[PDB]
Design a protein around this ligand. Sequence first.
Ligand SMILES: CC(C)CNC(=O)[C@@H](NC[C@@H](O)[C@H](Cc1ccccc1)NC(=O)c1cc(C(=O)N[C@H](C)c2ccccc2)cc(N(C)S(C)(=O)=O)c1)[C@H](C)O
Length: 372
Amino acid sequence: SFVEMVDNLRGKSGQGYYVEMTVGSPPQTLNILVDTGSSNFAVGAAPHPFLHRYYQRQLSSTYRDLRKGVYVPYTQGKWEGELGTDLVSIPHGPNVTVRANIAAITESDKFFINGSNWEGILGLAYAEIARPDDSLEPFFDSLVKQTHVPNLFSLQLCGAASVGGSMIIGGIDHSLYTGSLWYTPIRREWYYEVIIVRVEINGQDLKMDCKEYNYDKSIVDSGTTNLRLPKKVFEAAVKSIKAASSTEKFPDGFWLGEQLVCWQAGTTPWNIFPVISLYLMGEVTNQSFRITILPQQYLRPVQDDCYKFAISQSSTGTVMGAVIMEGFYVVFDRARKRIGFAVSACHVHDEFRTAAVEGPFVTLDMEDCGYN
Ligand SMILES: CC(C)CNC(=O)[C@@H](NC[C@@H](O)[C@H](Cc1ccccc1)NC(=O)c1cc(C(=O)N[C@H](C)c2ccccc2)cc(N(C)S(C)(=O)=O)c1)[C@H](C)O
């Protein structure tokens, strides 16, 4: 069942995790970026400098035009295209074929990435944020109503120059994580929004108003590279990581992601970089759990060893991107309106520290952490 889906994700470092899919009749094989931070299924349908191949509706026996246009803007990049429907299949997924909506991308800007090796995007979030509007069915909703595939999927993103991982569609593969799964409620169903109730850095409470962490939302977004934080939080955090690593000095544009930093290979001072603990709302009253991330997650690798600072500011709330998701087995349990976290089988090691998921913790007034 699920062993066929283990390792069905590929990618280049810093360029995104994709899965193999086929569209149309006869089947057109395509690499599709897996994005929990959006809800449209789209593929390049026109020649592009960065695209090795693209979707051809002309050669599809099954393609149906919807004669509606569509435009989709992300934080990074944008595109427009022609809405249609076609048969879609997942080679290393469940043994099924569904008719799903597909946006055929004819125009785009700063969206496709050179060398990334993917030609499309699979938005796995809810209809509420689908473009043009919620009447356009997202892929996973189509898959669930048309088949007996359970309303659940898991993502295990394995970090660094080739990355890989697993998208378990329809279930939970217990050989891919250690310890117990801890679950946080999905607050409402648009993005996969969660509520962060406490933040620690090297075991010291950031001591911020709970609400600041979730202003105006906090989402789990596999389509985003970084851990993005609200301005006030981000400044609090950076001040703390600086002070921890003040033993060395970096140009200020490093903390902005504008510049790299290098160390002679094998001498990277991981110790002076702190661990970050995010506390998430739990399932029972006054109960939370924490996930802890190593500097090996937010110092992304680019003779020597060079790194980019992968914590950034945001004006759309906290975005728990690949930085957080790598090294965790993440269960998007839509059926039970919850997201599970567990230490990944491909958690990446520190000599004297480890990524963790721990509970139970007690946290009072967790509902006050939510922003309205
Ligand atoms: C459709 C609507 C619901 C709009 N939704 C959204 O805007 C929300 N989520 C965004 C994602 O949907 C989209 C989908 C996408 C876009 C472009 C290329 C590939 C994939 N992603 C991004 O905007 C995005 C991408 C990157 C980035 O570089 N990604 C590469 C592919 C990657 C590398 C490694 C791991 C994962 C992804 C960065 C960023 N950053 C801003 S950063 C430098 O990490 O701080 C943002 C947003 C966070 O609020």
